Structure 1
């Protein structure tokens, strides 16, 4: 029972650097590399008294790789695992997928293949990236295509960052997203999306961080992606493995776009004054402003929901919590899945980083929910894409890389088909 966690782009490598410290603190692994089955999922054992993670950090530019090498987690990671390219992607899907990728995918595929051959209980892979930029779109699509053609049956967990409606970091983000989603629709078994302004607001209103940073944003993301696999890592009363996220939450082979959220989020002084029980966190996770994506769930319906609890929580109180949530009529479930809940529990509680913003809480929950609220966001993305596509804005860079307008049109009609499928299944 293992799984390999690969990272692409600045967002991916920063999330990996922010999360592997949490993993090592959870497993009791010091940064030097030394202190039975809990760490076997993510960390190997090299001979005697030494561990190495099952991860690779790949990026075309070296500005992230050299600082990761010269940081503080130097002795924990394998020096050869940190792959580095030679040229900048420059927010260009074509440049990240065709020119610069082809000279390093040959090494990357061989490296993941040989590090997977020694492994035997690999459940799947999880890829960290961001379609809002160039590297995390192009190289991710390039690797996932030739990974799906080779393995295919094995599961892939995508973790992507998407832009906000009113805010955007780049300017070619809708082109990058609409181009890469045409390939992500068929090869990605399931893909969790996160919005920047939602995760800025969640630490503003609740955690009371007036001036947050990307480290503070990535800490709770690391908590989420550690809590989903905490069931595999540690024993539980009702364990859920990685195949549950494929089997239960993907009712159709192409409708595989769930939203994500987490609770409780609370500062140190507020933790001692707010009580922790299952009811308030269950009410807050379904709260619309508490989500990690700026989408209104009230406009749509929930297709499926998996609740994963951590800490000393009995089954009875969570059963009562989901019962009263079902009787609550503010939310609305789809008629095609009345049994739309999948509850699971792990005994190992959440941990806290020394000096981190998060506080000690006796129990927690992560809520990955498949719903039709993302259809509005996709339609918004296509609407803002069409305005630039009509004027042929930012097209000379792409066509000067090797591509044309044909695959742009195919991306447009594929997004239209996605909207057609979503409005059809939401009826």
Structure 2
């Protein structure tokens, strides 16, 4: 019961899925062939890891996942790679021609040809669930598949599944690793189309992850490999609540209840601690109080924005490892008396806490040090709207001169879809301003 299907869309979405699934296997004791000696219930069970892994009669633990890209080259590496025996061929879906960093191609042109095949395979996975909770969608904002195909898939999933949970891990564009000049158009187009069709979305600023790798892990020019290894850790922290069981374990839905005050205000800020190198972690252990305080450090955020210049609407602390309530309670009490967190006048100032005892695992040949305890904070701050504004400014500069718009118009889109998307973004920015005003 309570199964979750993961959907990995485009290169960003697929490569992050590779990292995530690689890490879940390591955390549950699942071998690259899908075998799990730790599991005595052969052919199936009701265990907490079963929300993410299906079981075959043979004893193979199969990810409840679909990988989609409009081109073969990225998924082909999964088919050939270490975990080729982990997935059934039918879970790995490729086209022949990609969306060429164009929303219109992924949503319409190219995407229309593969959509029903993707839905069939999602349906096949859905049919093996005794009690489907919902979906986890991994994609980039900037790519044509990542933006347009995700939009189309989201719309179709709302039609096919109703109001069954749809969560996203969206890669926010950064110049340092940016592939296209039209990423701000694709980001605004996907955000508009998907807004109504998502219940919660975790944005990951590639610049924020880039900076952490450079600063905390002392990596000169971070690769997507380095980036995905750090995202793997944040994703694992948010899904640990679902993949493990415990007395102090609070479900992702309970965090969501607190994180979403209004349907459109469903973008939580993720902050992870500790991100430390093996060299810097040798003979230095960080306490519950140390890792907790590090969450209120803008340097550890998944999105670059200032929550100290914004207002909180929630704080959730998701602990991993050697953590006891006494210490968490004391660390929270300290931050509170330290009065560093300004909250909206309309909501309770409590901190919702979950704890899983299984400590964070590390991928061999990693930059990350294995720590005894880790924390992920999910906060709903008005500061996340800074990300919306930066992306909205870039869009504005280009759309004023109608720069590159013909590439979209030539694929069947109208100028009207652009202006309508942008007006939704102005409305969302206004909504984030409104929630931050004190009541009269």
Shift of 1:394: 0.3
Gaps of 5+ in 1: none
Shift of 1:232: 2.3
Shift of 1:272: 2.2
SS of the equivalent of 1:229 reads helix
Deviates more, 1:9-18 or 1:347-356: 347-356
What is the rounded CA distance, in whole Å, between the counterparts of 1:178 and 1:231 in structure 2? 31
What is the rounded CA distance, in whole Å, between the counterparts of 1:93 and 1:246 in structure 2? 29
After superposition, the C-alpha distances for 1:24-50 in whole angstroms (9 at most, x for unaligned) are: 111111112224824312111111322
Deviates more, 1:205-214 or 1:271-280: 205-214
After superposition, the C-alpha distances for 1:300-341 in whole angstroms (9 at most, x for unaligned) are: 112111111011211111111111112223332222223341
Aligned residues: 427
Deviates more, 1:37-46 or 1:256-265: 37-46
What is the rounded CA distance, in whole Å, between the counterparts of 1:195 and 1:380 in structure 2? 12
After superposition, the C-alpha distances for 1:350-398 in whole angstroms (9 at most, x for unaligned) are: 1122222211211111111111112222122222211111111001111
Asked whether the equivalents of residues 192 and 257 of structure 1 are also in contact (C-alpha less than 8 Å), the reply is yes
TM-score if structure 2 supplies the norm length? 0.93
What is the rounded CA distance, in whole Å, between the counterparts of 1:178 and 1:353 in structure 2? 34
What is the rounded CA distance, in whole Å, between the counterparts of 1:401 and 1:231 in structure 2? 42
TM-score if structure 1 supplies the norm length? 0.96
SS of the equivalent of 2:68 reads strand
Asked whether the equivalents of residues 258 and 369 of structure 1 are also in contact (C-alpha less than 8 Å), the reply is yes
Shift of 1:166: 8.1
Asked whether the equivalents of residues 33 and 85 of structure 2 are also in contact (C-alpha less than 8 Å), the reply is yes
What is the rounded CA distance, in whole Å, between the counterparts of 1:380 and 1:350 in structure 2? 33
Assess, with a 3 A threshold, how the Cα gap between structure 1 residues 380 and 269 changes in structure 2: closer, same or farther.
closer
Assess, with a 3 A threshold, how the Cα gap between structure 1 residues 289 and 139 changes in structure 2: closer, same or farther.
same
Residue of structure 1 equivalent to 2:282 = 272
SS of the equivalent of 1:122 reads coil
Asked whether the equivalents of residues 33 and 50 of structure 1 are also in contact (C-alpha less than 8 Å), the reply is yes
Large movers: runs of 4+ above 4 Å: none
Asked whether the equivalents of residues 130 and 137 of structure 1 are also in contact (C-alpha less than 8 Å), the reply is yes
Gaps of 5+ in 2: 37-45
What is the rounded CA distance, in whole Å, between the counterparts of 2:176 and 2:91 in structure 1? 38
Deviates more, 1:176-185 or 1:242-251: 242-251
What is the rounded CA distance, in whole Å, between the counterparts of 1:288 and 1:415 in structure 2? 24
Q: Specify which of 159, 162, 182 is matched with residue 172 of structure 2.
A: 162
SS of the equivalent of 1:39 reads helix
Shift of 1:196: 1.4
Asked whether the equivalents of residues 27 and 38 of structure 1 are also in contact (C-alpha less than 8 Å), the reply is no
* 2:226 is equivalent to residue 223 of structure 1: no
SS of the equivalent of 1:80 reads helix
Deviates more, 1:85-94 or 1:332-341: 332-341
Shift of 1:58: 0.4
SS of the equivalent of 1:40 reads helix
Shift of 1:167: 7.3
Shift of 1:165: 7.2
What is the rounded CA distance, in whole Å, between the counterparts of 1:87 and 1:318 in structure 2? 51
Asked whether the equivalents of residues 2 and 41 of structure 1 are also in contact (C-alpha less than 8 Å), the reply is yes
Asked whether the equivalents of residues 303 and 340 of structure 1 are also in contact (C-alpha less than 8 Å), the reply is no
Shift of 1:275: 2.1
Shift of 1:406: 0.8
Asked whether the equivalents of residues 143 and 186 of structure 2 are also in contact (C-alpha less than 8 Å), the reply is yes
